Amino acid sequence: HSDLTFCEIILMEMESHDAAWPFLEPVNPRLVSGYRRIIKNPMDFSTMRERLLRGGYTSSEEFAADALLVFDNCQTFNEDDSEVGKAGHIMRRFFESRWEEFY
């Protein structure tokens, strides 16, 4: 429980982060050409929010996996110096930092 309440703390802080705008909603393949083909397991903050609310996270490491999946998909699809890419690095570094503020 104390495990998964810090996940809420992290997810809340990630949802309201300045650089969270690319990862708030699922990627729209109708708008992002090639995303369907390149990324096989899309993930975003709202999907993590849906699952966490509904309790679908057995442990905190299942929560961290979905978080790292957001940024792996980001680095896979976006160049590091792209706008989404630059935001993904800010978000990936923020997550890992806050995550070790706990573990």
Ligand X SMILES: Cc1ncccc1N[C@H]1CCCS(=O)(=O)C1
Residues at the contact surface with ligand X, assessed by CB under 6 A: 22-23, 27-28, 31-32, 35, 74, 77-78, 84
Phi, psi of 80 (to 5 degrees): -60, -30
Tell me the closest approach of the beta carbon of residue 15 to ligand X, in angstroms. Answer: 14
- C-beta closer to ligand X: residue 8 or 25: 25
DSSP string computed for 4-58: HHHHHHHHHHHHTSGGGGGGSS---TTTSTTHHHH-SS---HHHHHHHHHTT--S
- C-beta closer to ligand X: residue 19 or 84: 84
Tell me the closest approach of the beta carbon of residue 20 to ligand X, in angstroms. Answer: 10
